Design a protein around this nucleic acid. Sequence first.
DNA 1: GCCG
DNA 2: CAGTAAT
DNA 3: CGGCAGTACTG
Length: 326
Amino acid sequence: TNHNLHITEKLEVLAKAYSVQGDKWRALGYAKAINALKSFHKPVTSYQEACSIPGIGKRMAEKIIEILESGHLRKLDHISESVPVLELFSNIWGAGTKTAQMWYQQGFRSLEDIRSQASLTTQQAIGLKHYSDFLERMPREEATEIEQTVQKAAQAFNSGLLCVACGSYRRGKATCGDVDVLITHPDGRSHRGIFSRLLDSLRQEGFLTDDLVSQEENGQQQKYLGVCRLPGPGRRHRRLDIIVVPYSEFACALLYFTGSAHFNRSMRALAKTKGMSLSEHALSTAVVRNTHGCKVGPGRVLPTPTEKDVFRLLGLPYREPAERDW
DNA sequence: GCCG
DNA sequence: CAGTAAT
DNA sequence: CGGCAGTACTG
Ligand code: NA
Ligand code: NA
């Protein structure tokens, strides 16, 4: 339970404003502080108490107190009038802050402006077509039906294929923004050439309705991001994201694709403090980095049969997927 | 924005 | 490459 | 000061 809703609600506004205007790192700082506040055991009632909490510094503390005393936040009143419009545009799949700001500068103010006048990438046109659907979450039960549709199609041409739904699904969420399907084969080799077979099968049953990201030219495709819809009435278009990985990469892929994103970043951050590196492919040791924290030497891949291995190798207690929201 |  | 995306 | 995660498409 959030014991500081009146605080975080207002900070969240300012946070999203920074995010759509492209101030990525300031927005990150806000997101951490906000999460810290959602998690504190009590109402925060003083400046000194606010500073005591990890993720909250003096600058955030001052804003917390201002809200606590005056019920308003001055910084809110002076947010650029463009921000609601920037948020509107940035919620088009395939458009980010740079495109949203360009569209705004060009005079566009509504999705109707975008449809009739804006230059749209192929992805952004699909995003616009499914604008509402892409902002909806589906019941986790529908995610199950989607995973089963992909699994049945995959296993139909290779029974050995393992398919698992990840992301918010695997973390136990009641609703899911998309379906993340990880596919591998416990024999190191068979997982090659399968995107082409899988996709053509899912198209032939009319399941896939649009492709957003799908490099099908050379058989080195690693991901599919697209759109599907189950049969029958009352069905919405749902985002479907599929990755196919070598078996030896299964645990790191499972871990990455399960998330959350913040959980991933925090775990990878920790790995870097230990001169290690964690990606969707592997956990590596003895990685060489320069003074800016940038990789200049590859390191060594560590064997990680299971998720518990990754945790173990990082000196971390295991955390079940449901406990990985942050 | 936070923090080492 | 810059932009956007995946978690 | 300056890092804030590590990856994969698009065009
Ligand atoms: Na977007
Ligand atoms: Na997801």
